[model samples]
Target: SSNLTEEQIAEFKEAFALFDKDNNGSISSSELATVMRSLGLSPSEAEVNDLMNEIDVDGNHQIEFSEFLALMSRQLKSNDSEQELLEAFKVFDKNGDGLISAAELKHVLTSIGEKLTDAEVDDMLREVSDGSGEINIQQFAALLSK
Candidate 1:
């Protein structure tokens, strides 16, 4: 169901061509590493090898379009849907006042084994609080979607 449309297919084909450095019909780990470097992500050799193992479904040491599409689909599906977003907001609304405070956000993050600096918390509050110094349910949902 996540198959790309005709227009998307054309775009993907162009991307595939650019990534297939050896003019091979598939994408290899080295090619993917080059693309990742271009995007400013410093992927290690082990990471790239792991990625190739996961995405190269045919065990050919390269990824075909279908395999690439499947990998992208899995990542895209991992994001929360609208309902999941609302549920997450409820979880963070500790006071049940229909809004989330900075303290609540910090507590929530800490509960999940994440430690946030004050500046990071402030940045998150600014982003999620809709300029009201408080994050309402809808605003929190939007932030989660982001």
Candidate 2:
């Protein structure tokens, strides 16, 4: 349902744990700011506050893991530097068949140190792949999107 990979999900969990300093499973706005900064994101304090309000669904000033996940997902896409998303997909579609299979995505991602589990890879494919379990270039690009 998202462009996120399992590796990224794990990374987000770790980052969330670090920011939820009190072990309350939630992060205050300041903590969120710290997390963003640590990730090299430079959203202003005002911007952070706005995001907090936007995703703070329960009307709480703090951000819970679920809320944080939504925030991160949006932030990840907003900050994507993959200007050559198509080019990257082209390389991954090594068979030159104009579509990418799970095996190919797994191979390329693993080679690049993404190291995703089979289930993880399948989940990613479930989001982008067709019923036949292959993704054309258009699907690949969509998979890379929010």
Candidate 3:
């Protein structure tokens, strides 16, 4: 709760509205999947069912707003500390220029003994870049978080 921004609160409210398709204040697995897909993520039918099983705290096969918020908030906190995420971005930005480049990415991964195909590297660069042919620390951190 302490870490939540006003934007996050607003986004959660909007998410609840989107999930409660029937306007019933509850969301089934299908509803959840629809929301996830809209966010550019695809959850398989089975995965959606599993998520419902795991997140439906009351065993009602539906998630209430409180339950949804709790689940997302807990996940956000558990994933990484701000410092840890920042350090990871620093490591990835190999040139110490406070930005990431394709050459730097390749060199960093290669140095770690990990081999990446050109296609894979391109895909990673596209994902982390801000559609501007370059990646700043925040963009890099967001990509790693995903």
Candidate 4:
């Protein structure tokens, strides 16, 4: 899956717009509680405070659309920052093919003694592919770029 899906982005925009009670581009902590309530979560004041502080990526104590997307998309995806991913990709492409195939992934992971299930190996490739059934440096670079 993508770091952020187009449909999820659209849905998030809709909800964020609805919850931006101050007509500002960002959502306040109070507004975030309201959003949680709408989703059937009765977040406490302290919980909201902690969450706001975490999601407030701009350090402005307010959650912007982009910041919210990052938090939400992070729930179920390979959300590693691109730099580390690229570096690891370099070390993982031990055969220097410039593309990560199932075999390369297998060897790289095994070489590092990182054990994953058969399903995990397949899932990782599926998540990073650019529709070509391969994970090239370019494809991985893009994931980190944005």
Question: lDDT tens digits, residues 1-146, model 2?
Answer: 44667877777788789867685788876578788787667987678878877756676578787877777777777334244555666877667756776676566555544445677667877776658867676564555443
What TM-score does candidate 1 reach?
0.42
lDDT of predicted model 3: 0.64
Could you tell which candidate, 3 or 4, scores higher by lDDT? Answer: 4
lDDT of all predictions: 0.62, 0.69, 0.64, 0.66
RMSD of each: 12.4, 10.9, 14.1, 12.7
lDDT (Cα, tens digit) per residue for candidate 1, span 40-89:
35657887788777766676567777776565454334444666656655
What C-alpha lDDT does candidate 1 achieve relative to the native structure?
A: 0.62
Ranking by TM-score: 2, 3, 1, 4
Candidate 4 residue-wise lDDT, 7-52, digit = tens: 7678778778888867667887657767657644565778677787
lDDT of 1 at 124: 62
lDDT of 3 by residue, 38-63 (tens): 64457677867777888766765677
TM-score of each: 0.42, 0.46, 0.43, 0.40
lDDT of 1 at 104: 64
Q: What is the lDDT of residue 25 in candidate 3?
A: 79
Give the poorly placed runs of model 2, Cα more than 4 Å off: 55-60, 78-146
**Lowest lDDT block of 10, candidate 2:** 78-87
The superposed Cα distance between candidate 3 and the true structure at residue 143, in angstroms, equals 28
Better of 3 and 4 by TM-score: 3
Cα displacement (angstroms), candidate 4, residue 105, comes to 20
Which number leads on TM-score?
2
Q: By lDDT, rank the candidates, best first.
A: 2, 4, 3, 1
